[PDB]
Design a protein around this nucleic acid. Sequence first.
DNA 1: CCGACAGCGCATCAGC
DNA 2: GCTGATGCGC
DNA 3: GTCGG
Length: 300
Amino acid sequence: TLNGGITDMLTELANFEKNVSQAIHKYNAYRKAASVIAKYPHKIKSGAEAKKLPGVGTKIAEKIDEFLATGKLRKLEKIRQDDTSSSINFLTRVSGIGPSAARKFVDEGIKTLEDLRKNEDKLNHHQRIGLKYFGDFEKRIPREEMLQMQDIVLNEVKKVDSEYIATVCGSFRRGAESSGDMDVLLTHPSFTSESKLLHQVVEQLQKVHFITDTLSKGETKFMGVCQLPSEYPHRRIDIRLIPKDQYYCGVLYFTGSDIFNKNMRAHTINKYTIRPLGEPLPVDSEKDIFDYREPKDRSE
DNA sequence: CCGACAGCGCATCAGC
DNA sequence: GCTGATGCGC
DNA sequence: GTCGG
Ligand SMILES: Nc1ncnc2c1ncn2[C@H]1C[C@H](O)[C@@H](COP(=O)(O)OP(=O)(O)OP(=O)(O)O)O1
Ligand SMILES: [Mg+2]
Ligand code: NA
Ligand code: NA
């Protein structure tokens, strides 16, 4: 776009730090810089101009100058042609394979999806599912499909027990036209702070063949795979069982957005409770914590 | 100069 | 067998 | 990598 070349450069640098160098803080640093630049409504003419923005320091300013003068970045060019770094970076696209597993695989010659297929015994359950739905997991989910997925979830949950309260949060609740996955928050009157509710819900969704695979499952959090009945790509779905008195704080947090949660927290609010500067305050709705904006306007 | 940068649920490893 | 650390995703 | 004590 205006600075798409710069933001793509920073994003690519971010991924290298995360996946190859294992520098999570430098990763977030590049992303923060890429984020502020993407929102900047001017054609950047120099690194000095960008350095005025928060999150952009000397090193990135120098990289921008090189980019604006050459149209590329020498360091990135070398990284792209490097077999080891590129293979490590690519393997991290598989769900369940992080920087550690990726580096470990590449060390022993395993560099591609094909290599992963003929090495199945070297992969855990999560990684196998990640390999199986590699393409599907990188697909976006249209809102129309999300609506259909929501129809099934709310219907089956209410069938298990009409006392349940389920809310699909994330970008979908914010009214987005597409979503990366489905985040479902679940609660029940019999479950308050420190009081098999999640299991029965998961089982029912597996019974109607909505949930197809399981990445992780515990007493409060489920991570798995689902698919609409036909063809349809397999989708990532998370289900969290949350106490009733911590439910709406969770709804607020998991609704987002990222910038909104950060802004609302600064102006203590965490995913669980809200406390004065102290003991958790009684919250029975999203409006309550606001009193101490509709999801469609929660971008920042 | 130098520490913070989100924190936690679950799976699986490291070690006793 | 167990506890704690680590990896991972979010 | 950037920010700020
Ligand atoms: N780093 C974070 N800080 C605060 N809240 C976060 C963070 N990461 C995720 N969340 C919360 C806000 C999001 O709405 C909620 C769901 O995470 P996400 O699924 O990443 O939101 P999204 O659903 O808007 O992304 P997408 O549309 O790509 O799935 O989790
Ligand atoms: Mg989401
Ligand atoms: Na700056
Ligand atoms: Na991964």
